[PDB]
């Protein structure tokens, strides 16, 4: 690909289904009502190519690619090892 | 001295038989050049009450200087649960305040200043809030003396 480097660091939760992993991403910003710093979590289901593996408990990176299925728009490139 | 008067009340104490109608007056006095004061009095007739108020206002004067014609910082008059906010104004735009406070700050000798009342609209406590707000301020020469600096830089 050529698109911008999507920085979507987050704790991948489960690869309960084959060649598919669900990762939650945490985003911090300023709430536009009281200027309080607030975070939200959002889920994303991504495809694992197979040459690189993502496991449970990791904090991995996600990039954009062509749509493979319904609500699966992304693929994984880098996997931070376990702890 | 200009000796302008502000809102007057109609009060009466109660005894056996009718009521003792004896209203009170409040007044502000100033030379429009730096010396100002205020007073409150009561009497049976208008001229006597006015004269007593003028006396009690004029004996109890206090001094305040003029910085370029306005105040250079913000003050919050806080007395008797009646706030009033004062914010600095440019070299000149025209006086903006409430009527009673308009008289108070015009008779002091200021050109223009940002004024807005908060809370109650009772003139006497409003004047007192203006007083303690304008008095408890401090000068750049004051901080120059107390801080280890000759001139404020």
């Amino acid at each position: 690909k050529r698109n911008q480097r999507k920085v979507l660091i987050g704790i991948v939760k489960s690869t309960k289904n084959a060649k598919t992993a669900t990762v939650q991403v945490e985003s911090r910003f300023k709430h536009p009502l009281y200027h309080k710093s607030v975070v939200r979590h959002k889920k994303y289901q991504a495809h694992n190519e197979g040459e690189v593996l993502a496991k449970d408990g990791d904090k991995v990176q996600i990039v954009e690619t062509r749509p493979l299925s319904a609500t699966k728009r992304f693929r994984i490139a880098k996997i931070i090892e376990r702890a | 001295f200009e000796e302008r008067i502000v809102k007057l009340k109609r009060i009466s104490k109660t005894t056996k038989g009718g009521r003792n109608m004896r209203f009170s007056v409040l007044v502000v006095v100033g030379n429009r050049k730096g010396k100002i004061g205020y007073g409150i009095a009561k009497a049976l007739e208008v001229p006597n009450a006015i004269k007593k108020a003028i006396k009690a206002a004029h004996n109890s004067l206090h001094t305040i200087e003029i910085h370029k014609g306005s105040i250079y910082h913000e003050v919050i008059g806080r007395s008797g649960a009646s706030r009033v906010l004062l914010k600095p104004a440019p070299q000149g735009t025209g006086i903006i305040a409430g009527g009673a406070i308009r008289a108070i700050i015009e008779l002091a000798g200021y050109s223009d200043i940002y004024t807005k009342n908060l809370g109650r609209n009772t003139p006497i406590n409003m004047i007192h809030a203006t007083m303690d707000g304008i008095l408890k301020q401090l000068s750049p020469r004051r901080v120059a003396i107390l801080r280890n600096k000759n001139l404020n830089e």
């Binding site: 200027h35 309080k36 710093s37 | 250079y72 910082h73 913000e74 600095p88 401090l138 750049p140 901080v143 003396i145 107390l146 801080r147 280890n148 600096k149 404020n152």
Partner: protein, 141 residues
Amino acid sequence: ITTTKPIKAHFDPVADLLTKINNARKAKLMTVTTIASKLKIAILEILVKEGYLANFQVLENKSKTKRIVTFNLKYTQRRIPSINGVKQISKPGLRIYRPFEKLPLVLNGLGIAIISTSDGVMTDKVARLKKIGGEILAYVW
């Protein structure tokens, strides 16, 4: 030298410093003691170096872990405080941040405002010279 009295932090040295200095000014006291951090020594230095305080000593013990600090208040004879009030802006319950262009002046800019920049805690206008922003910790007048 042998403070002899047990002390402890409040919840955060930032609020504790202002509360203790305000209480000392109100009660016309000389010094107080408070838990010391590198942020504490930095803030004390950058506030005293502008004539708003006096000598402050950081006090540690035989070990390298227990540190406190006590500061002398700025005063003039007849006991008129040089400090005319403090109000902390950044709170543990509410973070506040301000860019360079919107750093407010101290009631005309005549006073001193302490801004925690990305590289050094240091006052308002001399930070406006370097345009480096940060968070505002306290208004002192």
